[PDB]
Structure 1
């Protein structure tokens, strides 16, 4: 089976992006997968997306503008902290300039940049370039 929802979604996006395809299908939907997409659509990396309803589990559909290069998943959801933002941001990303790690917090779902700003660490979620 699949033991991470995110992993199932963002291996469709990455593959599709490397083939230059301008839409992708996503088999499941979660409250979580939504939030992840939302982020990247603000910062300009996605055109739009639709959630469709089968009344069992939804099928997300996304429009890629080709502005992504990867969307990963950090699977164990390891604990990152106020000092350790530095660590992750160096090690898994090609840059500090345009690398975006996305984290979970009690507050919501947000970029590392906004995480530091509000001074709360948390468990990591995923990342994109």
Structure 2
């Protein structure tokens, strides 16, 4: 059964991006997916995405711009304190110069760079670069 809606959303985008598609539909939609997309959008990894209301869970259509190499979830959602962010980046990111790990913290969903600035820990949702 559907266990992680975030995994389906990111897996669909990653497959579509490699195939060279311009648009991709994500179903079901969730506020976790939307916030994850916003983090990618702010860093210029996706274009404009639109949420469609179907009275059940909604759907999202995401415009791709070809800048996204890979995006995936980390399951299970391990706890990550501020001191342990450095270890995770050395494992999941191509280098120490680009790529973001998305964390869910008490202050909201944000990338690891923002988490260090606010000095807040949390759990890993995924990554992209």
**TM-score bracket for this pair, using the shorter chain length:** over 0.9
Per the TM alignment, residue 107 of structure 1 is displaced from its structure 2 partner at its CA by: 0.5
Deviation at 1:62, TM superposition (A): 0.4
Give the distance between the partners of 1:83 and 1:36, measured in 2 at CA. Answer: 23
Q: Considering only aligned residues, what root-mean-square deviation do their CA atoms show, in Å?
A: 0.7
For 2:106 and 2:60, locate their aligned partners in 1 and report how far apart those are by CA, in whole Å: 25
Alignment partner of 1:10 is 2:6: no
Q: Deviations over 1:25-45 (max 9, x none)?
A: 111000100000011111111
Using the size of structure 2 for normalisation, the TM-score is 0.97
Which whole-Å CA distance do the structure 1 matches of 2:83 and 2:39 have between them?
Answer: 23
Q: How many residues align?
A: 129
Match of 1:95 in 2: 95
Residue segments in structure 1 that go unaligned for 5+ positions in a row: none
Q: Does 1:22 align with 2:22?
A: yes
Aligned to 1:47: 47
Residue 46 of structure 1: how far off its partner (Å): 1.1
* Structure 2 partner of 1:114: 114
Cα distance in 2, alignment partners of residues 8 and 47 from structure 1: 19
- Structure 2: stretches of 5+ with no match in the other structure: none
The CA distance in 2 between the partners of 1:123 and 1:47, in whole Å, is 26
Q: How does 1:57-68 map to 2 (within 5 A)?
A: 57-68=57-68
Residue in 2 that maps onto 1:123: 123
